[PDB]
Structure formats: C-alpha cells, structure tokens
Design a protein around this ligand. Structure first.
Ligand SMILES: Oc1ccc2[nH]ccc2c1
Length: 224
C-alpha cells in the first residue's frame, strides 16, 4: 500500500509532520501531565473519518484506554464542529478499557480480528490508539530488580503494534507521560517521537525529537 496521512486539525502541526500522522507507522507523543496528549488523540479519532480532500481516510477507529480518560461527549463536540454527524462518528469507534498490563497485551491480539473483518469494506480500520501506553507497566514493575522484566514485556508489546501498522496499513498513535517525578520515553522503538509542552497563555508547543509548531485546544479539538 501507499503511505496514508491523517491531518491533526492544525495546519502548523501538519507542516511539522510532513502532512499529518502516517499509516504503516507508530507515532509516539510524550510530555507532562496536562500537556494535551489526550486532546490530540480525541481530535484524530474524528479527523480520520473525513474524506481525503479534507485530510481524512474514510477510516474506522479502535481505542485502548488505560486510565478512564475517553469522553464521548468530547467526541460529539469535535464532530459537530467539523461538519460531521456525531452519532455516525461514535458508531465507527470501537472502545475497550485495559484492566492491567497483561490484559492490555491481549487486547492488541484481539484487535486483529476486527481489523480483518473490516479490511474489504468501505470503512476499514485506519487508526489504532493506545492511551496511555506506559501507565500499567510503570505501576506494576517497581525497582531496579524488576526493570529487565518490564523491558521484556514492553518490547514484545511494541513489536505486536509495529506488525499491525505495517501488515494492515494502519496509523498507530500512542501517549506517554514523562515528568520529573517519574516516566520514561520508549527509547528508539516508535517510528516518530513528538515532544509536547504547555506555553504562555495556554498555547501548546510541539517539537520533533531526533522548528516548532504552535496550536490551541478549542471546540474543534485542536486548531492553529
Ligand atoms: O474486541 C475489541 C473491541 C474493541 C477494542 N479496542 C481495542 C481492542 C479491542 C478489541
């Protein structure tokens, strides 16, 4: 397949990305609590359902939640203000809550069955979200003695996600909380790393790790 691109809602961030987030890739966004990673995830789940003339891919969505942070009312607000029907948008998002890190690993395997089901329809899966990818692993494996086991399990989970992205032409989008009092970047595993932070007057600022884009959080999700 050719490489597909999903607009983020912001022309500034799209330019930084070369057009938007790519299919056949894992995109990792990281930053402090409150920086807006989950608002970017909600915006993409709506943007992907637009036609290509408007920056979408006529796609279906699959969402794995680890912290109870998905909000259908927020999805309805973004859709209504992007000219789509809110009921139709929610109908094409498949949602599951991960109980712990082992169950989170099984949910990715289960996702592959719905992906095959939709593959030859007019609304195939084009976006897979994991928010938050690291939270269960961090709280379950504490200490230096337990680090090697935590890294083993994380490495396998990332390889599972890479396989789905490439075999089925899907954009994988994952969030990771990193601050002074805890949190670790996924080293070199994702295809692309994006650093997110809050600036003066509630502007959000993004930079590619290995110029900068600037945007706001609004009724449209995010915009310049
Ligand atoms: O069977 C399902 C339904 C929704 C999902 N979201 C993520 C995995 C998954 C599996």
């Amino acid at each position: 397949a050719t490489i597909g691109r999903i607009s983020t809602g912001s022309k500034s961030l799209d330019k930084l990305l070369g057009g938007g987030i790519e299919t056949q890739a894992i995109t990792e966004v990281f930053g402090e609590f409150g920086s807006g990673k989950t608002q970017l995830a909600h915006t993409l789940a709506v943007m992907v359902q637009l036609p290509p003339e408007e920056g979408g891919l006529n796609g279906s969505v699959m969402w794995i939640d680890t912290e109870n942070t998905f909000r259908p009312e927020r999805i309805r607000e973004i859709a209504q203000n992007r000219g789509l029907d809110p009921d139709e948008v929610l109908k094409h998002i498949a949602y599951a809550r991960a109980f712990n890190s082992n169950h989170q690993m099984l949910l990715v395997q289960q996702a592959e069955d719905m992906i095959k089901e939709l593959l030859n329809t007019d609304r195939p899966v084009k976006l897979l979200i994991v928010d938050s990818l690291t939270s269960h692993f961090r709280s379950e494996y504490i200490g230096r003695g337990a680090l090697a086991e935590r890294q083993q399990k994380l490495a396998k989970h990332l390889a599972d996600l890479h396989r789905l992205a490439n075999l089925y032409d899907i954009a994988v989008f994952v969030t990771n909380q990193v601050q002074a009092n805890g949190g670790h970047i996924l080293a070199h595993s994702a295809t692309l790393r994006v650093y997110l932070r809050k600036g003066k007057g509630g502007k959000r600022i993004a930079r590619l790790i290995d110029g900068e884009a600037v945007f706001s959080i609004t009724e449209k999700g995010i915009e310049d």
